Amino acid sequence: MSHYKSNVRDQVFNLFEVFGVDKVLGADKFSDLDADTAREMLTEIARLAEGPIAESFVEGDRNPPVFDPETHTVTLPEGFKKSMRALFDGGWDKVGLAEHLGGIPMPRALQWALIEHILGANPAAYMYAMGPGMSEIFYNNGTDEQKKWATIAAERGWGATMVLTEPDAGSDVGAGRTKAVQQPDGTWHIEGVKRFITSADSDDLFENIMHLVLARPEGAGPGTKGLSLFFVPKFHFDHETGEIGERNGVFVTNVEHKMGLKVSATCELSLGQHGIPAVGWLVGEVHNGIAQMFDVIEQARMMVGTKAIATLSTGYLNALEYAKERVQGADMTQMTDKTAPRVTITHHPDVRRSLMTQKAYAEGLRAIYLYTATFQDAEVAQAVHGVDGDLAARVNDLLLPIVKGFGSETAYAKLTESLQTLGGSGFLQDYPIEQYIRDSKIDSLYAGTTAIQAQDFFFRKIIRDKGQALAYVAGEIEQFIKNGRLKTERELLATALADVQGMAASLTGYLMAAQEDAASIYKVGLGSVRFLMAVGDLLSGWLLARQAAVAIEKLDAGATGADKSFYEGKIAAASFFAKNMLPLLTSTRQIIENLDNDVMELDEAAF
Amino acid sequence: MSHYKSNVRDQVFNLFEVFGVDKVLGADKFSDLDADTAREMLTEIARLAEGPIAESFVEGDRNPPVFDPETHTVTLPEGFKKSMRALFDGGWDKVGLAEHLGGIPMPRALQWALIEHILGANPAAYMYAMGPGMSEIFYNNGTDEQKKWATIAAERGWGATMVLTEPDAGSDVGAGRTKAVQQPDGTWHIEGVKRFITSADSDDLFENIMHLVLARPEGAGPGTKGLSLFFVPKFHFDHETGEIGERNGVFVTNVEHKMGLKVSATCELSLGQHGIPAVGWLVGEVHNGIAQMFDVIEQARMMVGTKAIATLSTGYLNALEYAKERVQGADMTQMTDKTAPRVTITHHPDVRRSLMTQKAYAEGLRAIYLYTATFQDAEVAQAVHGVDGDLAARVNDLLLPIVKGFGSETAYAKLTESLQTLGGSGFLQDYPIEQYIRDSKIDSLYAGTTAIQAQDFFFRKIIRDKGQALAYVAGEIEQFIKLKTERELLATALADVQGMAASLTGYLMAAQEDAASIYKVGLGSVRFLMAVGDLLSGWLLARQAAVAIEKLDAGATGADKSFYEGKIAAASFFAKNMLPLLTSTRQIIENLDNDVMELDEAAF
């Protein structure tokens, strides 16, 4: 079914009219890619997403993969594999890949806009297709000889996995017990059982799979510092030609039954447990595991956040299309009259409230991840923001937990409004929104839970950063607030910005107080997620207000037709968000300012 | 054990230590039911729920019902039918049923506490068991001759359905096109196609099904007031002996594929479309359909709210059990130390925040539906609250959309915390939370959407009521206010809710001169309903904490003491972390404008 509804219009609005990413197209790194070609690419992949890729969305959930425990392999439904081949045949598993690996150079902001369509149409299909992007990470961290293997893996389209989690080491990656035994010739034998590994087998989609495995070398120290990263291929291969050889000793031994995202095989992975060594090669031939793996984690966190946002967007557009056609009830101005005309439900206030809530968050979230991506290239950050490379890296690092944590939590919550808009029909599998909800629930968990996002945000991206990136962003919001038709929105933003600054000061204060009373640190934990969500709301309202300022300029200049309607919606979204979402941060600030440890002192038996 | 984790302790605490429902036990209608027996009943049905009822919770979802087009019937999984037999064999489908239909007289507050356990363990099992209760409603509204059939239906345990919805008439009940044609012999032939009918077929669970069908007699008016209610049995039967006769012309034509609650067969139901007439009997031989039907609707709305609350409770207790045993991470006071000992995750602040949020809403919601139920018996309301019958009915009517709307929305939202507590494992079908979420999503839709609940609440239960029930409840909150910090926070919340009510009232009355003003009522209606729910939750938790303080001062020990300590902590947490948000919501409601209504549809 054609469940997927795309929004290239909003993407191009952000990329060119708001952020001006076209400034760098046709110049330096992107010398061979112009704005017209970028638009055509977005339109092409959106068309592919709405057609062949979206067409197996239902099939993958209703006819999910089947595991053969004796072969340690998974069979995927044929319709989904056809969608994968459509993706490969169009070169879309090589989006933004380095030119020397066969890719088309482009800014990250354009790359994630392209990927959004796959994540909206069939997110597991993009996940299976992340191999080449992970081969590039292996390339960047590898020896000269390992770079040769990475080039083969990328050219041949091998799949890949990130292998961290164990039954007793999920959020606490440093507790992992999977071990690496050094061999005389410099290779390693990996031994352990890992859990919840995405794409650990993928039927016959690929020639090979590159497992990137965190493991502790024998006798290494404890914690994350003692971990190393290893290249562990499913098949041994000829390192010069790429010709596939003997099966390596790394076998899927279970596939989980999940709430959603069912077509993505989520696997228990056994290394060196079946009498065959799991041979691994030390990435870069250095012991720097968690640093190397965080290149992979950051990409995964960006993908998950963008996935949540893509899913909410098509959720909203499905609900909108339904509301426009569903006739139910009289206009509320006519409710007493038992003979009044029945109207389409977009006429009802609560439906317009729901739809505008969906719209504002979906479009605010789209702006967030594209804004985040403009700091992922130094050249783009310099051209559009005027910030140097170091600050740009700090700002991207600050925004990733917002994209991931705030994005995942918001999308799942607002999809509830999408389903509600359909009434009783929303509970039916006939419509895609119940699957959107199930497929999206994992986004608050995979690649680090929301709580982990919030702790990374505060401790690493603000405190350890000495507030530099946060002060930059705050300065940009302040400058927008300074400098008629958006006065009330700017006043509401000024209050929200002050609220967030108050929150940051309070949590910082609790951290300082921990010098004297260690228990005071618990208050940082108690408030960390609410703080992360508040910054997300602040950024959403700010970027929506920036969009409204651009929309006002285009309307003043004489926009007509569909363009005019688009711009009018941007003004309404920014105003609605500022008046209905931002004021809550004031109460949240007061709640955070009054946190106490009563709930930490309570006996566990009292719960 | 099973997926289902019950909480009789909290139920008894509410029923006896907080509301004092035991005052009426052993007296008048409840002469034969004492406190000890009520508690034993709760314990016994909780065991039934945790045992045979919960046993098929997974099976019903993984092996869902099948529609057979060769016979126009639905087949149910054997394990679930075994659970249903355990329910009937125990005499539980006659809980709160009138004594003359074979029931055990009891306060409604006890009845719903008992039903909570079935709704938490396998809610579709209660829905299939709603037959006798709907037969009683037929009895009460029926003629003397019909009362005899209703007695047969109840005694034989026939299934029953509520038949309102059509493809173009869901929320708008009055737009239905199903028609009724009177026959020479005084019966009626019903013709129409109805949608989203729960329990429309039930395999071989019952010997008959009573369909209660809204239909428009030919020549009748256009609105809901033009509707009449008809008794339409699946099988004809002997009106004196109950012997089952020929098939009546009412057939299921499909079974919907749903996100959850899969073992409850939700079907399109066609009347008089398969070659033979769907014979119906005018209920009470009077044309008063929507009024008769809302007896059934009120019961359904109480059921849905209690279902949502029951599901959140077992979701919370599953998450708590998991958190107590899951070891992950060092204590936050030892973040820096990578050599530090690993702890169970109840040690982590965000987990305790999550668990206390689940606890406070689950227990606050249980208090709300039990509180609501104390107004559903005149003698209980008199005994425990000192309120006459008329005010009690108005207060119950005021609270029903909160139980349903606030309960359904809150339960689904907070189950998100329950699943989150499990980490990645929460996403697995190996644990029950993911099914709880899917089964719960329907609660905001079935028996009136949240928006319909909010409109009923404001327009019918407050405005048309001239604010009397609301004034009563506000007066009880103000009396408790007059636990110092909690009472101060409750005073702010009460004032916030009163400000909200005044603002929405202004928008409604201003619609006389400016029609579009009414839209601001719709814009704020749901947020107002949820705010009142938060206020009631905070107030009732504070009342529980006040009782808990008294019991602790009197020397409570051991598990009792732990329980009482938890109530104090939940009341304080709720007042400090949930109630203040109502202040921002009031100011938002006070500044509602119609920009979103004036926007071109094309701009969305």
Ligand SMILES: Cc1cc2nc3c(=O)[nH]c(=O)nc-3n(C[C@H](O)[C@H](O)[C@H](O)COP(=O)(O)OP(=O)(O)OC[C@H]3O[C@@H](n4cnc5c(N)ncnc54)[C@H](O)[C@@H]3O)c2cc1C
């Ligand atoms: C599984 C299931 C079980 C059910 N069981 C029963 C049952 O046994 N019998 C039965 O008769 N019904 C049953 N229902 C139907 C249910 O009771 C509701 O009447 C119906 O589901 C809601 O109407 P709809 O589905 O057509 O949605 P719609 O009426 O089309 O509502 C669509 C959207 O519009 C909104 N909307 C509609 N009118 C207004 C308005 N005036 N103001 C504001 N917003 C408005 C709604 O809130 C919703 O967001 C069931 C539903 C399902 C899915």
Ligand SMILES: Cc1cc2nc3c(=O)[nH]c(=O)nc-3n(C[C@H](O)[C@H](O)[C@H](O)COP(=O)(O)OP(=O)(O)OC[C@H]3O[C@@H](n4cnc5c(N)ncnc54)[C@H](O)[C@@H]3O)c2cc1C
């Ligand atoms: C479908 C799926 C796909 C996945 N894909 C991948 C993948 O490809 N590769 C991979 O390596 N991993 C993967 N994971 C694993 C995933 O990253 C972990 O499940 C997740 O990060 C948390 O680990 P856990 O499940 O053990 O939860 P736990 O770590 O046990 O967490 C349980 C709860 O405790 C909380 N908690 C734990 N520690 C703390 C703390 N210090 N402070 C506060 N709260 C805390 C959490 O927030 C959560 O609420 C996947 C998971 C799933 C379910």
